[PDB]
Each structure stands twice: as structure tokens, then as C-alpha cells.
Short mmCIF file of C-alpha atoms (C1' of nucleotides) and ligand atoms in Angstrom, two decimals:
data_model
loop_
_atom_site.label_atom_id
_atom_site.label_comp_id
_atom_site.label_asym_id
_atom_site.label_seq_id
_atom_site.Cartn_x
_atom_site.Cartn_y
_atom_site.Cartn_z
CA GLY A 1 -13.49 -34.30 6.53
CA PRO A 2 -16.28 -32.83 8.77
CA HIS A 3 -13.57 -31.30 11.06
CA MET A 4 -11.62 -29.46 8.14
CA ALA A 5 -11.99 -25.76 8.48
CA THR A 6 -12.44 -24.10 4.99
CA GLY A 7 -11.65 -20.45 5.71
CA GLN A 8 -15.07 -19.27 4.74
CA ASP A 9 -15.94 -17.57 8.05
CA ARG A 10 -15.53 -13.82 6.90
CA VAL A 11 -16.37 -11.58 3.92
CA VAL A 12 -13.41 -9.34 3.28
CA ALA A 13 -12.91 -6.75 0.55
CA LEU A 14 -9.99 -4.72 -0.48
CA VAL A 15 -10.57 -1.42 -2.38
CA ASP A 16 -7.76 0.06 -4.29
CA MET A 17 -7.97 3.44 -6.02
CA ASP A 18 -7.22 3.49 -9.78
CA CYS A 19 -4.11 5.56 -10.80
CA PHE A 20 -4.94 7.55 -7.62
CA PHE A 21 -2.65 10.62 -7.89
CA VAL A 22 -3.57 10.91 -11.59
CA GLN A 23 -7.20 10.89 -10.74
CA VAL A 24 -6.64 13.66 -8.07
CA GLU A 25 -4.77 15.83 -10.54
CA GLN A 26 -7.49 15.09 -13.26
CA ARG A 27 -10.32 16.07 -10.84
CA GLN A 28 -8.41 19.33 -10.22
CA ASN A 29 -7.45 20.08 -13.92
CA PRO A 30 -10.15 19.01 -16.38
CA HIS A 31 -7.69 19.40 -19.36
CA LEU A 32 -5.85 16.18 -18.06
CA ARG A 33 -9.11 14.16 -18.19
CA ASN A 34 -9.11 11.06 -20.52
CA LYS A 35 -5.58 11.93 -21.75
CA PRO A 36 -2.34 10.02 -21.32
CA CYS A 37 -0.85 11.78 -18.33
CA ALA A 38 1.41 11.21 -15.44
CA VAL A 39 2.35 12.62 -12.04
CA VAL A 40 5.99 13.65 -11.53
CA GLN A 41 8.00 14.64 -8.52
CA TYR A 42 10.88 17.14 -9.11
CA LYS A 43 11.70 18.33 -12.43
CA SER A 44 15.41 19.26 -12.79
CA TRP A 45 16.77 15.72 -12.98
CA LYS A 46 15.63 14.27 -16.24
CA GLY A 47 12.26 16.09 -16.11
CA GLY A 48 11.29 14.35 -12.73
CA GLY A 49 10.36 10.83 -11.59
CA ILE A 50 7.10 9.50 -12.57
CA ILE A 51 5.06 8.33 -9.61
CA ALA A 52 1.67 7.65 -11.24
CA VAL A 53 0.48 6.94 -14.77
CA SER A 54 -3.13 7.19 -16.28
CA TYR A 55 -4.29 4.00 -18.18
CA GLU A 56 -4.15 5.84 -21.44
CA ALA A 57 -0.40 6.36 -20.89
CA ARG A 58 0.28 2.88 -19.79
CA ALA A 59 -0.70 1.68 -23.21
CA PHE A 60 2.29 3.35 -24.52
CA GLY A 61 4.65 1.67 -21.78
CA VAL A 62 4.87 4.64 -19.34
CA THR A 63 5.62 3.24 -15.95
CA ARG A 64 6.29 4.38 -12.33
CA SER A 65 9.88 5.09 -11.53
CA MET A 66 10.58 6.10 -15.03
CA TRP A 67 12.01 9.63 -15.70
CA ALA A 68 9.61 12.03 -17.37
CA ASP A 69 12.05 12.88 -20.07
CA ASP A 70 12.29 9.13 -20.93
CA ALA A 71 8.44 8.64 -20.76
CA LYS A 72 8.15 11.43 -23.33
CA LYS A 73 10.19 9.32 -25.65
CA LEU A 74 7.43 6.46 -25.40
CA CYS A 75 4.53 8.99 -25.29
CA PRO A 76 5.28 12.46 -26.90
CA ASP A 77 1.99 13.85 -26.19
CA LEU A 78 2.21 12.71 -22.41
CA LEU A 79 0.67 15.46 -20.22
CA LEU A 80 2.31 16.03 -16.70
CA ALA A 81 1.24 17.25 -13.27
CA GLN A 82 3.86 17.93 -10.86
CA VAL A 83 3.62 17.19 -7.02
CA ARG A 84 3.77 20.22 -4.80
CA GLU A 85 7.18 21.08 -3.42
CA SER A 86 7.66 22.80 -0.13
CA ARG A 87 10.91 23.55 1.47
CA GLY A 88 12.66 21.68 -1.20
CA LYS A 89 10.91 18.37 -0.79
CA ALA A 90 7.93 16.74 -2.30
CA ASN A 91 4.67 17.58 -0.35
CA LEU A 92 1.94 14.85 -0.92
CA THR A 93 -0.62 16.70 1.40
CA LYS A 94 -3.12 17.12 -1.60
CA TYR A 95 -3.10 13.17 -1.96
CA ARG A 96 -3.32 12.31 1.61
CA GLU A 97 -6.49 14.69 1.93
CA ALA A 98 -8.10 13.04 -0.99
CA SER A 99 -7.45 9.82 0.60
CA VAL A 100 -9.22 10.87 3.74
CA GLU A 101 -12.21 11.87 1.36
CA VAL A 102 -12.30 8.20 0.23
CA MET A 103 -11.67 6.51 3.55
CA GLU A 104 -14.29 8.58 5.37
CA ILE A 105 -16.97 7.26 2.78
CA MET A 106 -15.78 3.70 3.18
CA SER A 107 -16.06 4.02 6.77
CA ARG A 108 -19.74 4.47 6.58
CA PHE A 109 -20.24 0.96 5.37
CA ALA A 110 -17.92 -1.06 7.58
CA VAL A 111 -14.75 -0.92 9.89
CA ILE A 112 -11.80 -0.32 7.61
CA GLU A 113 -8.19 -1.09 7.89
CA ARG A 114 -5.99 1.56 5.94
CA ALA A 115 -3.37 -0.35 4.05
CA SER A 116 -1.77 2.43 2.17
CA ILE A 117 -2.49 6.06 0.97
CA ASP A 118 -5.06 4.57 -1.47
CA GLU A 119 -5.96 1.06 -0.31
CA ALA A 120 -8.22 -0.12 2.44
CA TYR A 121 -9.51 -3.49 3.58
CA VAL A 122 -13.15 -4.00 4.64
CA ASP A 123 -14.52 -6.56 6.91
CA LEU A 124 -18.10 -6.93 5.56
CA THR A 125 -19.16 -10.13 7.60
CA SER A 126 -21.58 -8.24 9.82
CA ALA A 127 -23.07 -5.99 7.03
CA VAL A 128 -23.56 -8.98 4.96
CA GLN A 129 -25.57 -10.69 7.93
CA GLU A 130 -27.77 -7.77 8.30
CA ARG A 131 -28.44 -7.41 4.60
CA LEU A 132 -29.14 -11.05 4.19
CA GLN A 133 -32.08 -10.51 6.71
CA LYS A 134 -33.33 -7.46 4.93
CA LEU A 135 -33.29 -9.06 1.53
CA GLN A 136 -35.82 -11.78 3.02
CA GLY A 137 -35.03 -14.71 0.53
CA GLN A 138 -35.10 -12.59 -2.56
CA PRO A 139 -32.89 -13.49 -5.27
CA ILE A 140 -30.08 -11.27 -6.23
CA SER A 141 -30.48 -9.55 -9.62
CA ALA A 142 -27.70 -9.18 -12.03
CA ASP A 143 -28.53 -5.32 -11.94
CA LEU A 144 -27.06 -5.20 -8.38
CA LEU A 145 -23.63 -6.30 -9.72
CA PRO A 146 -23.04 -4.06 -12.78
CA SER A 147 -19.25 -3.88 -12.67
CA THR A 148 -18.60 -7.33 -10.84
CA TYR A 149 -16.50 -10.20 -12.23
CA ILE A 150 -16.81 -13.81 -10.95
CA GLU A 151 -13.39 -15.26 -11.12
CA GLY A 152 -13.26 -18.49 -12.99
CA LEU A 153 -16.54 -17.93 -14.87
CA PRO A 154 -18.02 -18.39 -17.52
CA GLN A 155 -16.88 -21.94 -17.79
CA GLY A 156 -18.04 -24.75 -20.18
CA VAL A 157 -18.04 -11.81 -28.05
CA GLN A 158 -16.80 -8.72 -26.14
CA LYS A 159 -15.45 -8.07 -22.76
CA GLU A 160 -18.72 -6.96 -21.16
CA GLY A 161 -20.88 -9.86 -22.57
CA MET A 162 -18.40 -12.35 -21.02
CA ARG A 163 -18.41 -10.60 -17.68
CA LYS A 164 -22.24 -10.96 -17.75
CA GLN A 165 -22.11 -14.61 -18.98
CA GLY A 166 -19.82 -15.46 -16.00
CA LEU A 167 -22.16 -13.46 -13.57
CA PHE A 168 -25.28 -15.32 -14.81
CA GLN A 169 -23.63 -18.63 -14.30
CA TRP A 170 -22.77 -17.77 -10.64
CA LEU A 171 -26.15 -16.26 -9.76
CA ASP A 172 -28.03 -19.18 -11.50
CA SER A 173 -26.29 -21.52 -9.16
CA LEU A 174 -26.68 -19.68 -5.88
CA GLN A 175 -28.50 -21.31 -3.01
CA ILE A 176 -30.56 -18.35 -1.92
CA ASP A 177 -32.44 -20.11 0.69
CA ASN A 178 -29.19 -20.96 2.69
CA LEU A 179 -28.39 -17.78 4.77
CA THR A 180 -25.08 -19.64 5.76
CA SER A 181 -23.93 -20.28 2.26
CA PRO A 182 -20.31 -18.67 1.95
CA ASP A 183 -20.97 -18.08 -1.90
CA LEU A 184 -24.18 -16.29 -0.95
CA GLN A 185 -22.27 -14.20 1.63
CA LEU A 186 -19.57 -13.33 -0.87
CA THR A 187 -22.39 -12.25 -3.46
CA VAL A 188 -23.98 -10.01 -0.83
CA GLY A 189 -20.62 -8.63 0.13
CA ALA A 190 -20.19 -7.75 -3.55
CA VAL A 191 -23.47 -5.98 -3.74
CA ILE A 192 -22.36 -3.79 -0.72
CA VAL A 193 -19.05 -3.12 -2.39
CA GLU A 194 -20.72 -2.02 -5.61
CA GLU A 195 -22.82 0.31 -3.49
CA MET A 196 -19.65 1.60 -1.72
CA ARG A 197 -17.90 2.21 -4.96
CA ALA A 198 -20.72 4.01 -6.21
CA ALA A 199 -20.72 6.28 -3.28
CA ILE A 200 -17.09 6.92 -3.57
CA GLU A 201 -17.29 7.89 -7.27
CA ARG A 202 -20.52 9.99 -6.73
CA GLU A 203 -19.17 12.04 -3.66
CA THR A 204 -15.38 12.37 -4.87
CA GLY A 205 -15.21 11.73 -8.56
CA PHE A 206 -12.75 8.84 -7.93
CA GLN A 207 -13.00 5.40 -9.45
CA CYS A 208 -11.51 2.40 -7.98
CA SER A 209 -11.31 -1.34 -8.19
CA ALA A 210 -12.00 -3.93 -5.52
CA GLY A 211 -11.67 -7.55 -4.52
CA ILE A 212 -14.31 -9.57 -2.52
CA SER A 213 -13.32 -12.86 -0.91
CA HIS A 214 -12.94 -14.55 2.45
CA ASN A 215 -9.70 -13.16 3.55
CA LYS A 216 -7.28 -10.20 2.93
CA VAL A 217 -4.83 -12.07 0.72
CA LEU A 218 -7.56 -13.39 -1.69
CA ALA A 219 -9.36 -10.07 -1.68
CA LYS A 220 -6.07 -8.13 -2.54
CA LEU A 221 -5.45 -10.81 -5.32
CA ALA A 222 -9.06 -10.45 -6.58
CA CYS A 223 -8.90 -6.81 -6.69
CA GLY A 224 -6.06 -6.80 -9.39
CA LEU A 225 -7.73 -9.40 -11.55
CA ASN A 226 -10.04 -6.74 -13.39
CA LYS A 227 -8.52 -3.36 -13.15
CA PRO A 228 -9.58 -0.44 -13.54
CA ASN A 229 -13.06 0.58 -12.45
CA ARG A 230 -14.13 -3.07 -11.79
CA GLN A 231 -14.55 -5.61 -8.98
CA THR A 232 -13.80 -9.31 -8.67
CA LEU A 233 -15.38 -12.11 -6.46
CA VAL A 234 -12.90 -14.87 -5.84
CA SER A 235 -14.87 -17.64 -4.10
CA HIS A 236 -13.35 -20.55 -2.04
CA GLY A 237 -14.19 -22.83 -4.88
CA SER A 238 -12.23 -20.68 -7.42
CA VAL A 239 -8.89 -21.03 -5.52
CA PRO A 240 -7.53 -24.43 -7.02
CA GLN A 241 -7.83 -23.34 -10.56
CA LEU A 242 -6.61 -19.57 -9.72
CA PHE A 243 -3.67 -20.87 -7.70
CA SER A 244 -2.66 -23.53 -10.25
CA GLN A 245 -1.03 -21.01 -12.57
CA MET A 246 -0.58 -18.17 -10.01
CA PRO A 247 3.10 -17.21 -9.62
CA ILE A 248 4.12 -17.42 -5.95
CA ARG A 249 5.44 -13.60 -5.97
CA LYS A 250 1.97 -12.46 -6.74
CA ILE A 251 0.72 -13.37 -3.37
CA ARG A 252 0.89 -10.52 -0.63
CA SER A 253 4.30 -10.95 1.42
CA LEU A 254 5.58 -13.40 -1.09
CA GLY A 255 7.00 -10.90 -3.49
CA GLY A 256 10.44 -10.59 -1.93
CA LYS A 257 13.21 -12.87 -0.48
CA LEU A 258 10.89 -15.39 1.28
CA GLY A 259 8.92 -15.91 -1.99
CA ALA A 260 12.18 -16.34 -3.88
CA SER A 261 13.30 -19.04 -1.32
CA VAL A 262 10.02 -20.94 -1.60
CA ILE A 263 10.69 -21.07 -5.38
CA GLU A 264 14.21 -21.93 -5.09
CA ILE A 265 14.15 -24.47 -2.06
CA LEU A 266 10.98 -26.34 -3.15
CA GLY A 267 11.67 -26.11 -6.88
CA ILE A 268 8.14 -24.84 -7.61
CA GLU A 269 6.65 -21.87 -9.47
CA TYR A 270 3.02 -21.53 -8.67
CA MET A 271 0.97 -21.12 -5.44
CA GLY A 272 -1.07 -24.12 -5.83
CA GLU A 273 2.03 -26.50 -6.01
CA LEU A 274 2.44 -25.70 -2.36
CA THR A 275 -0.43 -28.01 -1.38
CA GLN A 276 1.89 -31.04 -1.97
CA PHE A 277 3.93 -30.31 1.23
CA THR A 278 3.11 -31.21 4.75
CA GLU A 279 2.89 -28.30 7.37
CA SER A 280 5.80 -29.65 9.17
CA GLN A 281 7.89 -29.62 5.72
CA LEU A 282 6.97 -26.04 5.21
CA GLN A 283 7.64 -24.96 8.85
CA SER A 284 11.08 -26.68 8.52
CA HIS A 285 12.25 -24.71 5.49
CA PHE A 286 10.54 -21.47 6.40
CA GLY A 287 9.76 -21.36 10.07
CA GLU A 288 6.97 -22.10 12.36
CA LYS A 289 4.86 -19.03 11.51
CA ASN A 290 5.58 -18.92 7.81
CA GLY A 291 5.06 -22.55 7.33
CA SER A 292 1.72 -22.69 8.93
CA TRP A 293 0.72 -19.55 7.08
CA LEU A 294 1.79 -21.04 3.70
CA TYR A 295 0.15 -24.34 4.41
CA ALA A 296 -3.10 -22.74 4.99
CA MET A 297 -2.78 -19.83 2.37
CA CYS A 298 -2.13 -22.28 -0.69
CA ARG A 299 -5.51 -23.76 0.28
CA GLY A 300 -7.08 -20.34 0.17
CA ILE A 301 -7.18 -20.06 3.96
CA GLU A 302 -5.80 -17.02 5.97
CA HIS A 303 -6.77 -15.63 9.28
CA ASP A 304 -5.07 -12.24 9.38
CA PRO A 305 -7.78 -9.89 10.76
CA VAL A 306 -8.90 -6.56 9.20
CA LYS A 307 -7.52 -4.38 11.84
CA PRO A 308 -9.76 -1.46 12.88
CA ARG A 309 -7.34 1.36 12.03
CA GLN A 310 -7.92 4.34 9.73
CA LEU A 311 -5.00 6.44 11.00
CA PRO A 312 -1.21 5.75 10.56
CA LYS A 313 0.69 4.88 13.79
CA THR A 314 3.73 6.71 12.72
CA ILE A 315 4.14 10.22 10.83
CA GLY A 316 7.33 10.47 8.76
CA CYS A 317 9.23 12.91 6.60
CA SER A 318 12.06 11.82 4.42
CA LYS A 319 14.23 13.04 1.59
CA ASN A 320 16.90 11.28 -0.48
CA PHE A 321 20.11 13.02 -1.64
CA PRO A 322 21.42 10.96 -4.49
CA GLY A 323 24.80 11.20 -6.41
CA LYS A 324 26.54 14.43 -6.22
CA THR A 325 23.74 16.06 -4.02
CA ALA A 326 24.68 13.90 -1.09
CA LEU A 327 25.03 16.17 2.11
CA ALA A 328 28.79 16.63 2.86
CA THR A 329 28.94 19.57 5.26
CA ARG A 330 27.44 20.07 8.80
CA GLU A 331 25.64 23.29 7.95
CA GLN A 332 24.05 21.25 5.06
CA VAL A 333 22.92 18.45 7.35
CA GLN A 334 21.44 20.76 9.84
CA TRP A 335 19.51 22.82 7.24
CA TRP A 336 17.80 19.86 5.69
CA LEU A 337 16.94 18.58 9.15
CA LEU A 338 15.38 21.83 9.91
CA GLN A 339 13.45 21.58 6.56
CA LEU A 340 12.14 18.10 7.27
CA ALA A 341 11.26 19.06 10.82
CA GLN A 342 9.28 22.06 9.66
CA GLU A 343 7.37 19.82 7.34
CA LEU A 344 6.75 17.32 10.12
CA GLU A 345 5.81 19.96 12.69
CA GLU A 346 3.16 21.16 10.30
CA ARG A 347 1.62 17.59 9.88
CA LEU A 348 1.89 16.68 13.47
CA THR A 349 0.12 19.78 14.54
CA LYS A 350 -2.79 19.01 12.14
CA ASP A 351 -2.82 15.64 13.37
CA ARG A 352 -3.07 16.61 17.06
CA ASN A 353 -6.11 18.84 16.17
CA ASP A 354 -7.66 16.35 13.80
CA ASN A 355 -7.12 13.21 15.71
CA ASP A 356 -6.72 14.08 19.46
CA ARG A 357 -3.18 12.28 19.93
CA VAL A 358 0.43 13.40 20.53
CA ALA A 359 3.56 11.69 19.27
CA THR A 360 6.08 11.04 22.08
CA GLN A 361 9.23 9.53 20.29
CA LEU A 362 11.15 10.84 17.26
CA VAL A 363 13.15 8.50 15.21
CA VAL A 364 16.00 9.85 13.09
CA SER A 365 17.36 7.56 10.29
CA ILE A 366 20.12 8.37 7.69
CA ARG A 367 21.64 6.75 4.88
CA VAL A 368 25.46 6.88 4.22
CA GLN A 369 26.78 7.06 0.69
CA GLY A 370 27.64 3.58 -0.81
CA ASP A 371 25.14 1.69 1.26
CA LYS A 372 22.42 -0.23 -0.58
CA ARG A 373 20.18 -0.50 2.46
CA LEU A 374 17.24 1.63 2.91
CA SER A 375 18.59 2.90 6.39
CA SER A 376 22.20 2.86 7.42
CA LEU A 377 21.36 3.78 11.06
CA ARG A 378 18.22 4.58 13.28
CA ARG A 379 18.31 6.42 16.70
CA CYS A 380 15.37 7.85 18.72
CA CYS A 381 14.92 10.53 21.16
CA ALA A 382 12.15 12.07 23.37
CA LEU A 383 9.52 14.11 21.41
CA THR A 384 8.15 16.55 23.94
CA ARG A 385 7.42 19.85 22.03
CA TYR A 386 6.05 20.11 18.51
CA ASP A 387 8.78 22.77 17.65
CA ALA A 388 10.89 22.31 14.38
CA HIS A 389 13.90 23.97 15.67
CA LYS A 390 13.88 21.77 18.75
CA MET A 391 13.29 18.52 16.76
CA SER A 392 16.07 19.24 14.14
CA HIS A 393 18.45 20.10 16.87
CA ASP A 394 17.74 16.82 18.79
CA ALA A 395 18.00 14.85 15.56
CA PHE A 396 21.31 16.37 14.91
CA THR A 397 22.44 15.70 18.55
CA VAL A 398 21.36 11.99 18.05
CA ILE A 399 23.44 11.53 14.88
CA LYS A 400 26.35 13.76 15.42
CA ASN A 401 28.93 11.16 16.20
CA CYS A 402 28.25 9.08 12.93
CA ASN A 403 30.22 12.00 11.44
CA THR A 404 33.84 10.80 10.81
CA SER A 405 34.82 14.42 10.48
CA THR A 406 32.71 21.70 9.19
CA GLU A 407 32.59 18.69 6.94
CA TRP A 408 30.37 15.49 7.08
CA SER A 409 31.89 12.10 6.10
CA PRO A 410 30.70 10.08 4.91
CA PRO A 411 28.08 12.15 2.91
CA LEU A 412 24.57 11.48 3.75
CA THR A 413 22.21 10.20 1.02
CA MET A 414 19.02 10.09 2.86
CA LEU A 415 17.51 11.84 6.06
CA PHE A 416 14.31 10.65 7.69
CA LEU A 417 12.43 12.06 10.66
CA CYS A 418 9.57 9.85 12.06
CA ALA A 419 7.15 10.71 14.90
CA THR A 420 5.95 7.66 16.77
CA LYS A 421 4.57 6.25 20.02
CA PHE A 422 1.42 8.36 19.93
CA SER A 423 -0.73 8.86 23.06
CA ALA A 424 -4.27 10.05 23.39
CA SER A 425 -4.55 13.82 24.04
"C1'" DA B 1 19.35 9.35 -9.49
"C1'" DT B 2 13.13 6.44 -8.12
"C1'" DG B 3 10.66 8.68 -3.95
"C1'" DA B 4 8.09 9.24 0.02
"C1'" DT B 5 5.90 6.81 3.37
"C1'" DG B 6 4.30 3.09 6.46
"C1'" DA B 7 3.54 -1.79 8.78
"C1'" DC B 8 5.47 -5.37 11.10
"C1'" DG B 9 9.17 -9.09 12.37
"C1'" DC B 10 13.47 -10.60 14.66
"C1'" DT B 11 16.79 -9.92 18.09
"C1'" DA C 1 16.71 -0.59 20.80
"C1'" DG C 2 18.17 -1.12 16.37
"C1'" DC C 3 17.94 -3.65 12.03
"C1'" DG C 4 15.56 -6.28 8.28
"C1'" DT C 5 11.62 -7.34 5.19
"C1'" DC C 6 7.67 -6.20 2.37
"C1'" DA C 7 4.44 -3.14 0.81
"C1'" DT C 8 1.58 1.16 -1.87
N1 LIG D 501 6.70 1.74 -5.52
C1 LIG D 501 5.71 2.46 -5.13
C2 LIG D 501 4.43 2.04 -5.37
C3 LIG D 501 3.28 2.97 -4.76
N2 LIG D 501 3.75 3.99 -4.11
C4 LIG D 501 2.82 5.03 -3.58
O1 LIG D 501 1.27 4.29 -3.53
C5 LIG D 501 0.52 5.11 -4.44
C6 LIG D 501 -0.65 4.22 -5.14
O2 LIG D 501 0.29 3.14 -5.59
P1 LIG D 501 -0.57 2.11 -6.68
O3 LIG D 501 -1.74 1.71 -6.04
O4 LIG D 501 0.50 1.04 -6.72
O5 LIG D 501 -0.62 2.76 -8.06
P2 LIG D 501 -1.69 3.53 -8.63
O6 LIG D 501 -1.05 4.89 -9.35
O7 LIG D 501 -3.05 3.83 -7.81
O8 LIG D 501 -2.11 2.62 -9.93
P3 LIG D 501 -3.08 1.29 -10.02
O9 LIG D 501 -4.53 1.69 -10.90
O10 LIG D 501 -2.33 0.20 -10.55
O11 LIG D 501 -3.68 0.88 -8.58
C7 LIG D 501 1.21 5.85 -5.55
O12 LIG D 501 0.77 7.05 -5.80
C8 LIG D 501 2.48 6.13 -4.55
O13 LIG D 501 2.26 7.23 -3.69
C9 LIG D 501 5.14 4.44 -3.98
O14 LIG D 501 5.28 5.49 -3.44
N3 LIG D 501 6.14 3.69 -4.45
CA1 LIG D 502 -4.03 2.25 -6.67
#
DNA sequence: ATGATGACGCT
DNA sequence: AGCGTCAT
């Protein structure tokens, strides 16, 4: 009772850019703004593969991974922007650079963990503490939270009026006098996230959504509840009702085989149903670490820290060669390894200038035709010089003998070069 | 014939 | 070391 930890020790946000690649292309090309549009990679095969979709185009059913020719069937007026292609492969440099624009703004407010090209977690616990002292005991005005939803409220007209009704019920109940109230801490966290999101939009033109809660899993779930261009506060108290109809696969790390096995072995559907099992029962089905994690998570409790990490730990370059394009001669394999190695050298050289580090290991991964796995084979070698001809030759040497005989058999459907094991320089 | 990319766990 | 899982 008095010794039951409630997982309310931190304020954590997750910031997620809305249709990110689309916003990057729309900033650059005003003719694309406020239109059904998508970002595509390649072009010759069925018009290219869709990677990102504006909310106007999503209303027609356009989705990621769809071929652009097929998307045009659902949305004949769909506008398209193409990803840059360099040395025969898609070149995402424009979007990584726009990502850095955003991450550098967020880093002004708190330590961030880069979660992907367009997501970062924020540990706001200290910023909230400082802000709670500056705001003496003053109440929090609804005007400081103009894009915030309070999940679960209102309880007991149009979209915006309902948002404000919920926000009013939340603020009216807040114990402003208690500087240790977790609900007050989340609310201040949301005020800071409003400021952070305003700064991102002012300084880059980009809109985003955010979740604010007590841990990373709840912040990530919260972020998706009201997209786009809104933020959502998930309090500890909101968790039982929210989890009572929340499919297990929606929780971060439960979207794959482990989540499917929770459903199958326990015969449940929703995250809240996990509360009925003991920690030992969950550890027996899913392992010590997974069971302890599940036991706490279904109660809204998670301790995974926001890691102080803005830079990737690996830098990689990959390309698929599907169907009849599979690489089937030694010259082909060697030419494409050179193309990937040239793009990788370019990124590594910029990384060494920008971030004062050198990679020391080169990982080479290939996929062989007829293998459903992401990678058929991984080998490593020393990365001593940032020279593309050397890296591609080393990569070849390391995979040479996977060839079961001028010809390459079986043909390669993927090539992957990854620079890893960075050291300060 | 979705991709390109990246983190981390298990052994 | 090398493979498997899960994610944007
Ligand atoms: N299966 C996926 C999902 C995402 N991504 C990468 O992650 C980026 C951002 O993904 P995501 O946040 O899922 O999509 P958005 O386009 O930003 O849409 P949303 O508004 O839903 O966040 C994409 O551009 C893409 O580069 C990817 O490569 N493969
Ligand atoms: Ca996004």
C-alpha cells in the first residue's frame, strides 16, 4: 500500500514529426502545401514506392509502401515528390539534415534521446522542477495549453470545444499548492512541450505531435492519440480505462512475435487484462526480463531511461535488389559495393568533421535470393581508412566465399554496409 | 518488388 | 561474433 511504487517519478515526452518527409518537401516546394501529396522513392517500377503521405492524401486511402501508380488509382490528383537518387540509390540526406534542425531546437529545452529520423524522447523532470519554482504557486491557465488533450477527459459539439472541456476539467481539479503532485508535474511538462513545439514550428516550419506522460511507452502511446499537430497528456490515473480496450500490439515492443504470443498463450486481447496475472506467471511464459516488464507496464509503470543520445551509434548504407534485378555476376556485386561505399564514405567524412569521431569496424550484410530474412549473412572487418575503394574491396573479400560459383550464385537481393564502433577523434 | 536505416537482445 | 527482433 504505502510501499507500492506508482511509476510517477519522471516527466517524459515523445515528439513525433507529422508526415515528416512530406513536410520537408512542402516547405521546399510551396505548390505542394495543403494538397494531397506523397514522397516516393525510385520511379521506374510502378511509379515508385510511397514512403510518406500527407494527411489530405491519407483521406483517400493512400498509404506507405503502396506503389505510386496504385496510389493514383485512389487519388488521381495526388502530387508527388521524389527522393533524391545518388549512385543508383535513394539518398535521404535532405531529411536527415531537416531532422538535425528539429533535434537541435529540442536540445535547447532538455536532454533528448533520438528514437528515429523524426522522433525524440525528452526527459523533462528537471525542467518541470525549475519551472514549478518560477511559477510560484500561480495557477496554470488554459491559454498555456492551446493544443493539449487530456486523455480520458471530458467525463461525466465540435472537436475543439471538447478538447477545451476536457482541459478545463483537468485544470479545475489540479492541486497547484503541491509541488510533488505527479499530475501537476505532467501539466507543467505539457506547458514546456507546447513551448518546444511552438519553437520547432517557428524556426523550421514543421509541425509535430507529442505525448507527455511518466515514461517512454506511455508518452509514445499518448503522442499517437491526437495526430496531427496536437499533444496529449496521459496521466497515471488515466491508465486503467485507456488500457482496458487498448490492443496489446499497440504498446511499443509488443507489435511483433512477443505481443502475438502474449495474446495466444494468455488468451487476452487488451493491455489491461495483463493485470490479472502474477509477476511469476508472466516470467514463466515470457522470461524473467519480459515478465517483470509486462507486470509493471500493464499498470502504467516502466523504468527505461531517456538515454542522452542525439547521434546514431552506427552509420549504414543499404540497397535491395528484388526480383530479376538480383545481382548475379561478380562485377555487379563489386560495382554496387563500390556505389554503397562511396555514399558511406561521404556520410562518414561529414560525421567525422561534424561530431569528432571515427568508426573502427565495417559490417557487411547480404541477403540471398529466396531468403525471407532481412539479412542472410553478416561479417565484419577493420575500418581503418575512410576510402570507398578500400571499404568495397574489404567488403568483397569478407563475403567472397559465400559465392557458390564470373558469376555469383545464388544472386544477392540485398547489400548492406554499416560503419560501427565509433571512437572519439 | 517496399525501402532505408537503426537499436538492442541472445548466444 | 553472428543472428534474431522490433522499430520509424
Ligand atoms: N515502415 C517504415 C516506417 C517509417 N520509416 C521511416 O520513418 C519515417 C517517419 O515515419 P513515421 O513517423 O511512421 O511516418 P510519418 O510520415 O512521419 O507520418 P506520421 O504523421 O504518422 O508520423 C519515414 O519517412 C521513413 O523514413 C520507414 O522507413 N519504414
Ligand atoms: Ca512521424
